[PDB]
Amino acid sequence: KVPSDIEIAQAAKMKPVMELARGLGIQEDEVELYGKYKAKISLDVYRRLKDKPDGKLILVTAITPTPAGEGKTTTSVGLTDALARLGKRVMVCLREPSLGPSFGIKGGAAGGGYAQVVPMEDINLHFTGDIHAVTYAHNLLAAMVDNHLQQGNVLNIDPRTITWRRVIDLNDRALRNIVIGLGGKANGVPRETGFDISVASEVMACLCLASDLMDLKERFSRIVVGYTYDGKPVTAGDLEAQGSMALLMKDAIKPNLVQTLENTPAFIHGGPFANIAHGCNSIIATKTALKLADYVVTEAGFGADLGAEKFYDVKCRYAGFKPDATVIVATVRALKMHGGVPKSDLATENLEALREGFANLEKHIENIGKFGVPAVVAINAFPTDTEAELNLLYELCAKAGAEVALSEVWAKGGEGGLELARKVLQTLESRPSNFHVLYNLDLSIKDKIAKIATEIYGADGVNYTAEADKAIQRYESLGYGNLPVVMAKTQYSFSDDMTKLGRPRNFTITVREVRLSAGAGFIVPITGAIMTMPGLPKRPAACNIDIDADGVITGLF
Amino acid sequence: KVPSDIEIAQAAKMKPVMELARGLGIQEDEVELYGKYKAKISLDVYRRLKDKPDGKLILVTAITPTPAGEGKTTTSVGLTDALARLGKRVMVCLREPSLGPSFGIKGGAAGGGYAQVVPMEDINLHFTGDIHAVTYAHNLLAAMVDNHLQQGNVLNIDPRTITWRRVIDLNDRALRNIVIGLGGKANGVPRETGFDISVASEVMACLCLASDLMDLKERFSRIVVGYTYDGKPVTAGDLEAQGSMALLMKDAIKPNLVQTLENTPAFIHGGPFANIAHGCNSIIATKTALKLADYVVTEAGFGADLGAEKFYDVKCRYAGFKPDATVIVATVRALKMHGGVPKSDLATENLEALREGFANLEKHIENIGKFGVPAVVAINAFPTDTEAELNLLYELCAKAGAEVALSEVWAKGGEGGLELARKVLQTLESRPSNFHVLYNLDLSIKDKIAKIATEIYGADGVNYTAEADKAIQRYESLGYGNLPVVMAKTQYSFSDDMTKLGRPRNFTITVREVRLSAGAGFIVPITGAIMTMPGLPKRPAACNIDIDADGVITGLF
Amino acid sequence: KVPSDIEIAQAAKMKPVMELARGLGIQEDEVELYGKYKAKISLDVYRRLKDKPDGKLILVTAITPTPAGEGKTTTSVGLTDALARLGKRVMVCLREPSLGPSFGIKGGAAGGGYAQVVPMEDINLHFTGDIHAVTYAHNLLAAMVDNHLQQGNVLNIDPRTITWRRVIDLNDRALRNIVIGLGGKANGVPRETGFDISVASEVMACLCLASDLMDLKERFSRIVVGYTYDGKPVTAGDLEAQGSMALLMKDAIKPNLVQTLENTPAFIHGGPFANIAHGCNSIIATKTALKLADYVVTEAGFGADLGAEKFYDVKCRYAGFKPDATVIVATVRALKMHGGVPKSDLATENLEALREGFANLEKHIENIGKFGVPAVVAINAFPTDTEAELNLLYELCAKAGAEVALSEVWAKGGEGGLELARKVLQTLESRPSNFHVLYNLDLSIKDKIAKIATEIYGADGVNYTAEADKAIQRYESLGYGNLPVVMAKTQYSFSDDMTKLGRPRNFTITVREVRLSAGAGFIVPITGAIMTMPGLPKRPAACNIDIDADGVITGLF
Ligand SMILES: Nc1ncnc2c1ncn2[C@@H]1O[C@H](COP(=O)(O)OP(=O)(O)O)[C@@H](O)[C@H]1O
Ligand SMILES: Nc1ncnc2c1ncn2[C@@H]1O[C@H](COP(=O)(O)OP(=O)(O)O)[C@@H](O)[C@H]1O
Ligand SMILES: Nc1ncnc2c1ncn2[C@@H]1O[C@H](COP(=O)(O)OP(=O)(O)O)[C@@H](O)[C@H]1O
Ligand SMILES: [Mg+2]
Ligand SMILES: [Mg+2]
Ligand SMILES: [Mg+2]
């Protein structure tokens, strides 16, 4: 009865975004078309509107996901469309989907059913070339580092201490660990290295936290690539790369204006994952939106223990933002998995499993409450959620003493979210927010890690491999102790162990390796077995993907 | 009717070699036993006998071989035993068999049937530890080069120009091309390198050309391992390795006294291949023998185009030796292959194929004639050679105007070689020898290569990959232009192409790569597709090899 | 001014070992000579003497070492000469020194000063070629594995699960992690691997545990080299290598007779280190010696936490030995270090530091107690040791209630060990032992690791990496949980952290990898950061090593 997401999105009727742009106080000459239905907005907009009030910032987070994902994006789009249908001047900010997973298992990040962002197949693929620009600035610097070595290694880099990897925006497990520079003296210096997925690039991180291009250029210059034989850092600015890198990012800095199925305006800009990067769209896109709309709905990657924590502690911190509300996306199907139902068994009514699994939602609620921001739960109704299940979960959130609304936006568009949209509005004028960060920058890297570990995931404490201890020692002694922490861990549990479902108790977080993002300005401790480059499944989506003589596309989702 | 070679050799009745040693003017205290049946002889022997006359030097060479090999060793042992049975004070000098091929396809190098050197399984395996000492001196230096790099690379070596490889005395194709030094800064410097088979080591080459240990130590020091960033050679003596290397060779320098099935004394010492190294036993062993015997029978590796040429042009040249006679080993089965008979078809009478194939023998004859040394052909009779075939070949050598004798030594021991033994003796007192080298040291590396290429193999000229041209340029400009040439090429043809049987005409030798043995004092141009490390077959001999509770050994050959 | 080890040892006055052997009732035809002064003794000696009575077994162990070593070997030899000088029929059993450390930092393992085993230079270099025999059996198995991958990978081995490594008897850090099999389809199958030092070989383990050559062979056949794609184990037996592996071991299996400076007989057989391997000489040498002497002195590598532990729990367990007494070697310098004094200062008087550092020795004393064997402390006097220092320690070991004797065997030979020899004799007359193992084979792998960590090292618990977890579970599931355990762990601490000196408290062991030795018959958990292939220092002893034209050796120590 509901057709495939690509059928829906190829049948969308879109407004010219030059219109939407003008319907928002954006001058004809601050728009740069990419066809009729996509544009980039000048940063002169936010500059000229510098001293004007902000609208209401709404974050959308979720519970602990299955591989299918639980509907933040779908919801965020839905919520925005619903608010438009109560006549509000609203905008949704989102992340650009990584190209890789569209050919893997997760698919794109445009939403679902009647809550989608269109032109969906442009959004999921090349979109407007932002990720490509990140990839080329990133890999440019890498080429220059390798050329430095070849051209007599003037700065005396120890090639075996180079942390700068390369990137490609595909799921390519064969490029995790590689030796390059082979073939003899004409062909470079042999060394061990590898690729991360482009969206996890520090270059993207910079895009996402910078305020303008000149700042991006300054940040690029601070990026640390390796170390000399006697341990002194070597930066991109030592290698004089920041100018070219910036040049390659000349258009990528400007955010992108698309729209929803119901013609509501949308910014898409930046796309770092939350398990392996900071999980928010650009600061640039959200500060702009907030000068142009009254309500700005925005998403953080994966669960509340990842994206929400990072949204609050890194992005909101660097931006000045004060979230007004937070929506917590929950599903019956996932809360059931969390209570012991097998993945292949999730479409079957199971009410006990929804009482048991609830622990998960409960901790996410408690954790958001910790930031001082009023929450609403949103029940994302799935095709096969039953009558009782949907009734029980509702009652558990009110019994839990927390705002809640059913959301039928997947199946019904914005009018699936009016209930939800009111409750959020109710929240805005009734419970003001009192946001504050989880931790002060002061603290040791190790104390900061322990605050997240215990306050958010609920472990007893934090294990450190000796490689981690050295790295941290090195980062504190060089004067980067102040930076905040972007944790890498599995999205599938509060723990660093992906098998531990629900609210797991009495465990340890094992920090394997610690990275320094001197340009983005944060520290990345890698926990558990998480990789910074994902792989493809037995049957990649790519095998079912196609296009025809008419431009009809199948298998994209 | 003839039992397996290992049955024969385990049933040998051996004299105590301390006896044989004394039966030769060797003092009780110049012998170092390794059991009753193997010893090492002091170099004080040759030193004290410095100014005493030499005996007659007899070389044993052959035609172009099949994979089975054509019987030089078997013959050399046979010839020696036959001469003993005409009451002569004779000794045979041979090469130590490489361990690797005993587990591969060729097997050992102790001889065959009733012409063998015993204790055969000691000779084929660890023998007296000479090859192990080469391997450890060689790999010691390699370890020190790698440690130099790790310890701050004081001499400024460009690790990508290191020519020093590692060695192991096995047929291990997986170690041809390897990257080592991986795992990060605590674990070395990544680089591309590999292993050659121990018997092809420059360290062995040195053993084989040195006169005493102090000379070996001096030669070790001249070995060139790599080059600095600005192209200056780096030597083992720069790295101060020659003392330890020499130390590891303290016993390996002394030659080994074993004996034949018929109790005739034997020296075994050094074992470089002839296709990929210089193909002679040590100078040390042959100069000693020649002070202790009246007739000294000695072997050069593979065909006359390889071993004989190198025996004359490198060893005899550096030693002073003047070969008195040369025996050319020929077989019907091989001359048949050379005339177009498939390998799986060689046990079947084929007289036309023996007239056609003869071209091969004819060129080897002409080539030896070129050195000014009187030749006898030896027909090594194989179990299935027919009556007519053996008759025809005889007549072709006399018709060819060249001395010839049937040799039944494989099946009958020394009394299979009396005919042969007389003809050689006939030769000694009737046709004096007038040996002289093929070329003067003066010449360019390139002229020297062309002399061998055209005079010996019969190609039109010599191709050079650009890598070869650079290397040669580098070796001439550093002042190693004078050194002689040890060619690497296939044993299976006069050409550098192994498929070209018989006397192939109008072809080119392609020199792929050129190596410098500054310690051994020669240049090694690698031609065709020949590797310096061989591989194992589909079913390695090793699968049929065993020993039992009694020490009965099967499958060694 | 005791002359350097090498001057003493070259100046030695030895007896032919043939005499030495007759005086133990070994027959002429059971001795196989390697010079006048080395032999290999037939396994027939032990066999024929099977039902005769065993002598007293005495273990020599030590406290936690400095890098230079605290004198176990120096003491084992001394003790043995000292016993002989008390008119006792006594034999020392030692391990063949690994070759690489002669060129490294540690040096050889022939003893020191006037307590050495001889001929030193041989004993430390190629000796009788046992290690080479190990090296070639191990590396032929590795060559056959790679060849199998090349010839169709018929057994379906997953090349990336291959645990079998290569070996070489050098300190080569560049061979730790390597990529082999490169160069294309003719040159093998690319894979990650590396080299361990030859003495840490499973082949070495088997030699050290086996009873005869047919036993060795059977052990070989059961060695697991890696796994199929679906997880089945693959053995040397499946590849039919055990036959050829045994051939190469035909002589390695027989133990070696040498002697001390004072001409006491000596067995030297098997070389395994105690940090990365099982750290005792062969059962063969020990059990044989127990038939020929009334007293058999024998050493375990590094400290009691490694060597003694393993001697007791795997050697004695498998051999049916019940050790009779145990010497703990201790020095002022090592104890001073343990009480905080920096290495560069261990020459200088500091009674206080020695008092605090006593903690180390105390724990080792306690630990030996848990085995049921009476102990004597041997205080091995160094030239730097002051009067009051040797007195304090003596008084401390007495107050601690331990039998103690000052030892001057380094400087005085066997007559400097009479007091020590006296105390040992005293212990054997009055105080029988009630030897018991530390754990049963019934226990699980983690049970047995936790006992050794807990009761011996004084660890609070053990941590496992995911990979360690998996390998343990793999081994239990496959039928090997029953095996005893040979921990790999730093020698420099009771902990797995090499800087935690004295008697570290409240620490945990971390197991990062678990090897299976299915043919030796034990399990090897690797802990902390310890590598199974060591490195060469800033300045190798190699650089200082030399031999002259007279055969006068310098630098070897
Ligand atoms: N209520 C729903 N019913 C069915 N499918 C849904 C629903 N909500 C989302 N989906 C689909 O499941 C996937 C997960 O939704 P998405 O918004 O991408 O979640 P998230 O952003 O949390 O990963 C997408 O394919 C989406 O189209
Ligand atoms: N006349 C013969 N009949 C049968 N087999 C022989 C004969 N001569 C040699 N062989 C065997 O064939 C192989 C080649 O002989 P060998 O002396 O090793 O030749 P080369 O030294 O030229 O390689 C050896 O296995 C040898 O025992
Ligand atoms: N009492 C001593 N005085 C001086 N040097 C010694 C003494 N005892 C041993 N040494 C030397 O110190 C090193 C370590 O002795 P060693 O017996 O090898 O101890 P271990 O066997 O425990 O390593 C050797 O070089 C040895 O000759
Ligand atoms: Mg999403
Ligand atoms: Mg031969
Ligand atoms: Mg020792």
mmCIF file of N, CA, C and O in Angstrom, chain A residues 310-348:
data_model
loop_
_atom_site.group_PDB
_atom_site.id
_atom_site.type_symbol
_atom_site.label_atom_id
_atom_site.label_comp_id
_atom_site.label_asym_id
_atom_site.label_seq_id
_atom_site.Cartn_x
_atom_site.Cartn_y
_atom_site.Cartn_z
ATOM 1 N N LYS A 310 27.230 14.202 22.003
ATOM 2 C CA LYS A 310 28.188 14.989 21.190
ATOM 3 C C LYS A 310 27.594 16.294 20.631
ATOM 4 O O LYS A 310 28.278 17.335 20.569
ATOM 5 N N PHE A 311 26.321 16.232 20.235
ATOM 6 C CA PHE A 311 25.575 17.430 19.897
ATOM 7 C C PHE A 311 25.640 18.481 20.996
ATOM 8 O O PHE A 311 25.844 19.655 20.703
ATOM 9 N N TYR A 312 25.458 18.051 22.248
ATOM 10 C CA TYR A 312 25.457 18.984 23.379
ATOM 11 C C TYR A 312 26.864 19.443 23.772
ATOM 12 O O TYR A 312 27.094 20.634 24.014
ATOM 13 N N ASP A 313 27.796 18.487 23.830
ATOM 14 C CA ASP A 313 29.085 18.703 24.465
ATOM 15 C C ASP A 313 30.179 19.266 23.571
ATOM 16 O O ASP A 313 31.237 19.699 24.077
ATOM 17 N N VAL A 314 29.953 19.212 22.257
ATOM 18 C CA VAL A 314 30.958 19.642 21.297
ATOM 19 C C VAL A 314 30.410 20.746 20.391
ATOM 20 O O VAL A 314 30.928 21.866 20.378
ATOM 21 N N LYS A 315 29.357 20.424 19.643
ATOM 22 C CA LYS A 315 28.737 21.360 18.714
ATOM 23 C C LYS A 315 28.062 22.496 19.443
ATOM 24 O O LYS A 315 28.469 23.655 19.257
ATOM 25 N N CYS A 316 27.054 22.186 20.270
ATOM 26 C CA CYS A 316 26.352 23.257 21.010
ATOM 27 C C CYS A 316 27.374 24.084 21.797
ATOM 28 O O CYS A 316 27.308 25.324 21.803
ATOM 29 N N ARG A 317 28.355 23.402 22.395
ATOM 30 C CA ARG A 317 29.441 24.063 23.111
ATOM 31 C C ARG A 317 30.220 25.043 22.238
ATOM 32 O O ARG A 317 30.384 26.188 22.616
ATOM 33 N N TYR A 318 30.707 24.600 21.084
ATOM 34 C CA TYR A 318 31.446 25.504 20.199
ATOM 35 C C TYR A 318 30.581 26.576 19.526
ATOM 36 O O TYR A 318 31.079 27.645 19.171
ATOM 37 N N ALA A 319 29.295 26.296 19.343
ATOM 38 C CA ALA A 319 28.418 27.237 18.647
ATOM 39 C C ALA A 319 27.771 28.310 19.535
ATOM 40 O O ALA A 319 27.620 29.459 19.103
ATOM 41 N N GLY A 320 27.400 27.946 20.766
ATOM 42 C CA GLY A 320 26.687 28.866 21.667
ATOM 43 C C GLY A 320 25.229 28.465 21.804
ATOM 44 O O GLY A 320 24.505 28.972 22.653
ATOM 45 N N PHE A 321 24.810 27.521 20.975
ATOM 46 C CA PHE A 321 23.425 27.088 20.915
ATOM 47 C C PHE A 321 22.900 26.682 22.273
ATOM 48 O O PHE A 321 23.655 26.176 23.114
ATOM 49 N N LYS A 322 21.604 26.894 22.482
ATOM 50 C CA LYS A 322 20.963 26.394 23.688
ATOM 51 C C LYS A 322 19.710 25.637 23.292
ATOM 52 O O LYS A 322 18.637 26.211 23.233
ATOM 53 N N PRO A 323 19.846 24.335 23.019
ATOM 54 C CA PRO A 323 18.689 23.549 22.634
ATOM 55 C C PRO A 323 17.471 23.878 23.486
ATOM 56 O O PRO A 323 17.588 24.046 24.691
ATOM 57 N N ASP A 324 16.314 23.971 22.848
ATOM 58 C CA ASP A 324 15.094 24.320 23.543
ATOM 59 C C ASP A 324 14.317 23.051 23.897
ATOM 60 O O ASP A 324 13.784 22.927 24.985
ATOM 61 N N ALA A 325 14.262 22.105 22.980
ATOM 62 C CA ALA A 325 13.601 20.848 23.248
ATOM 63 C C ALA A 325 14.450 19.739 22.662
ATOM 64 O O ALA A 325 15.395 20.015 21.951
ATOM 65 N N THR A 326 14.111 18.492 22.987
ATOM 66 C CA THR A 326 14.768 17.318 22.450
ATOM 67 C C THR A 326 13.720 16.273 22.304
ATOM 68 O O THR A 326 12.988 15.965 23.253
ATOM 69 N N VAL A 327 13.657 15.718 21.107
ATOM 70 C CA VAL A 327 12.761 14.628 20.823
ATOM 71 C C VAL A 327 13.539 13.330 20.815
ATOM 72 O O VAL A 327 14.591 13.247 20.186
ATOM 73 N N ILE A 328 13.004 12.307 21.479
ATOM 74 C CA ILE A 328 13.698 11.033 21.601
ATOM 75 C C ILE A 328 12.939 10.022 20.786
ATOM 76 O O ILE A 328 11.823 9.647 21.152
ATOM 77 N N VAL A 329 13.543 9.551 19.700
ATOM 78 C CA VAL A 329 12.837 8.627 18.821
ATOM 79 C C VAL A 329 12.871 7.190 19.337
ATOM 80 O O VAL A 329 13.937 6.635 19.572
ATOM 81 N N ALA A 330 11.704 6.592 19.539
ATOM 82 C CA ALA A 330 11.645 5.213 20.018
ATOM 83 C C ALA A 330 10.800 4.311 19.125
ATOM 84 O O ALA A 330 9.807 4.757 18.530
ATOM 85 N N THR A 331 11.194 3.045 19.026
ATOM 86 C CA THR A 331 10.389 2.070 18.294
ATOM 87 C C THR A 331 10.124 0.817 19.082
ATOM 88 O O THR A 331 10.927 0.398 19.918
ATOM 89 N N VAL A 332 8.974 0.222 18.805
ATOM 90 C CA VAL A 332 8.554 -0.981 19.489
ATOM 91 C C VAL A 332 9.512 -2.099 19.102
ATOM 92 O O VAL A 332 10.131 -2.715 19.972
ATOM 93 N N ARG A 333 9.654 -2.310 17.792
ATOM 94 C CA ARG A 333 10.579 -3.297 17.222
ATOM 95 C C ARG A 333 12.008 -3.305 17.850
ATOM 96 O O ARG A 333 12.638 -4.357 17.961
ATOM 97 N N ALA A 334 12.512 -2.147 18.266
ATOM 98 C CA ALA A 334 13.864 -2.089 18.810
ATOM 99 C C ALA A 334 13.800 -2.379 20.291
ATOM 100 O O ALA A 334 14.547 -3.229 20.797
ATOM 101 N N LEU A 335 12.893 -1.704 20.990
ATOM 102 C CA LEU A 335 12.726 -1.993 22.405
ATOM 103 C C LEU A 335 12.456 -3.482 22.649
ATOM 104 O O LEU A 335 12.775 -4.001 23.716
ATOM 105 N N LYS A 336 11.919 -4.171 21.641
ATOM 106 C CA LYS A 336 11.681 -5.614 21.730
ATOM 107 C C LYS A 336 12.996 -6.399 21.592
ATOM 108 O O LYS A 336 13.270 -7.317 22.379
ATOM 109 N N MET A 337 13.810 -6.027 20.601
ATOM 110 C CA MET A 337 15.149 -6.591 20.428
ATOM 111 C C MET A 337 15.920 -6.475 21.754
ATOM 112 O O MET A 337 16.540 -7.457 22.211
ATOM 113 N N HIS A 338 15.814 -5.301 22.390
ATOM 114 C CA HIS A 338 16.515 -4.986 23.642
ATOM 115 C C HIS A 338 16.069 -5.756 24.833
ATOM 116 O O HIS A 338 16.733 -5.724 25.873
ATOM 117 N N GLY A 339 14.932 -6.434 24.701
ATOM 118 C CA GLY A 339 14.380 -7.271 25.756
ATOM 119 C C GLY A 339 14.537 -8.750 25.474
ATOM 120 O O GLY A 339 13.988 -9.581 26.191
ATOM 121 N N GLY A 340 15.273 -9.087 24.423
ATOM 122 C CA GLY A 340 15.604 -10.481 24.147
ATOM 123 C C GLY A 340 15.007 -11.098 22.900
ATOM 124 O O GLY A 340 15.157 -12.286 22.672
ATOM 125 N N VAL A 341 14.330 -10.317 22.073
ATOM 126 C CA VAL A 341 13.791 -10.897 20.852
ATOM 127 C C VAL A 341 14.848 -10.872 19.757
ATOM 128 O O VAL A 341 15.464 -9.815 19.496
ATOM 129 N N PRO A 342 15.078 -12.048 19.139
ATOM 130 C CA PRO A 342 15.945 -12.203 17.982
ATOM 131 C C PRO A 342 15.559 -11.225 16.884
ATOM 132 O O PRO A 342 14.405 -10.800 16.806
ATOM 133 N N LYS A 343 16.532 -10.873 16.051
ATOM 134 C CA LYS A 343 16.347 -9.876 15.011
ATOM 135 C C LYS A 343 15.364 -10.416 13.965
ATOM 136 O O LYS A 343 14.444 -9.715 13.549
ATOM 137 N N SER A 344 15.534 -11.683 13.597
ATOM 138 C CA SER A 344 14.626 -12.360 12.668
ATOM 139 C C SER A 344 13.241 -12.652 13.269
ATOM 140 O O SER A 344 12.405 -13.295 12.628
ATOM 141 N N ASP A 345 12.998 -12.175 14.488
ATOM 142 C CA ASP A 345 11.745 -12.462 15.199
ATOM 143 C C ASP A 345 10.954 -11.202 15.604
ATOM 144 O O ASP A 345 10.005 -11.286 16.402
ATOM 145 N N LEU A 346 11.327 -10.051 15.035
ATOM 146 C CA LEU A 346 10.862 -8.739 15.525
ATOM 147 C C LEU A 346 9.483 -8.279 15.017
ATOM 148 O O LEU A 346 8.820 -7.438 15.643
ATOM 149 N N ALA A 347 9.039 -8.849 13.901
ATOM 150 C CA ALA A 347 7.711 -8.549 13.382
ATOM 151 C C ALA A 347 6.549 -9.259 14.124
ATOM 152 O O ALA A 347 5.397 -9.095 13.740
ATOM 153 N N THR A 348 6.842 -10.027 15.174
ATOM 154 C CA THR A 348 5.802 -10.781 15.912
ATOM 155 C C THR A 348 5.472 -10.149 17.268
ATOM 156 O O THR A 348 6.373 -9.829 18.046
#
